Amino acid sequence: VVGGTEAQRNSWPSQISLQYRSGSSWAHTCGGTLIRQNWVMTAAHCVDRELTFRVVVGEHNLNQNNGTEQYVGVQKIVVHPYWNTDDVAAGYDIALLRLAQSVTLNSYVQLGVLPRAGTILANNSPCYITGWGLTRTNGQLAQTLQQAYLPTVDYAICSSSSYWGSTVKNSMVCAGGDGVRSGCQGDSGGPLHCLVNGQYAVHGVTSFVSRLGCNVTRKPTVFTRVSAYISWINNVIASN
Ligand SMILES: *[C@](=O)([C]([N]C(=O)[C]N1C(=O)C([N]S(=O)(=O)[N][C])=[C][C]=C1C1=[C][C]=[C][C]=[C]1)[C]([C])[C])C(F)(F)F
Ligand code: NA
């Protein structure tokens, strides 16, 4: 997250750290959202390789041991059937990971609330992006969970010529674009928390930014629109 601030230790309990094993060590690669005690929602482009993964819940400081962490292995990975490995622009950037063991809920680990199917937010809706991604374009990962205020840019403006054009589809949510705050490498798959009816609901799965820079003006961070995938999510979960 570029231009963010460290989140409070129990502010976003549904945020998870998706890590892959390199050699003997583990390394954070993407974010994700706990949606069931044994299911995590993330971006398809995070779990596209045949890597060995683990999910860390109740995590705050990537390096230090906070004492609230639960590490569980990934048992099953279900990427959306229409996801094309190359294509972040084509859409369908969503995946569900079945955990090897159910996690224990407490104040540091909670389930994320999903929007009702089809829900579209009005322009400039208040949302926050969270993650341990790069704090600067070509910089390094954040040690502690970062958060940034990233209000929505409705599709009409986002899909215009001076923003993203046809790259952004109706099944995506745009947020930010002020040139100061944005998602960045390592934030992928994480949540876009939006305040709706007094409740923070997970409206997006962090997908992409401009390869020219993370915090590029008129290039808001783009997320997979969760509300467009409610039926798919429930079908997957009901089936396995
Ligand atoms: C994730 O943290 C980051 N996501 C990506 O880098 C996804 N991404 C892109 O943002 C682009 N941008 S583009 O070239 O401007 N296309 C519109 C291209 C490719 C990818 C991509 C695809 C497949 C695998 C990895 C990256 C954050 C910036 C959200 C991360 F690093 F992917 F995990
Ligand atoms: Na930690």
UniProtKB/Swiss-Prot annotation:
Source species: Sus scrofa (Pig)
Stored SUPFAM superfamilies: Trypsin-like serine proteases
Family: Belongs to the peptidase S1 family. Elastase subfamily.
SMART domains: Tryp_SPc
Function comment: Serine proteases that hydrolyze many proteins in addition to elastin.
Record's keyword annotation contains Flavoprotein: no
Cofactor: Ca(2+)
GO CC annotation: extracellular space
Gene Ontology terms: biological process: proteolysis
Protein name: Chymotrypsin-like elastase family member 1
E.C. number(s) listed in UniProt: 3.4.21.36
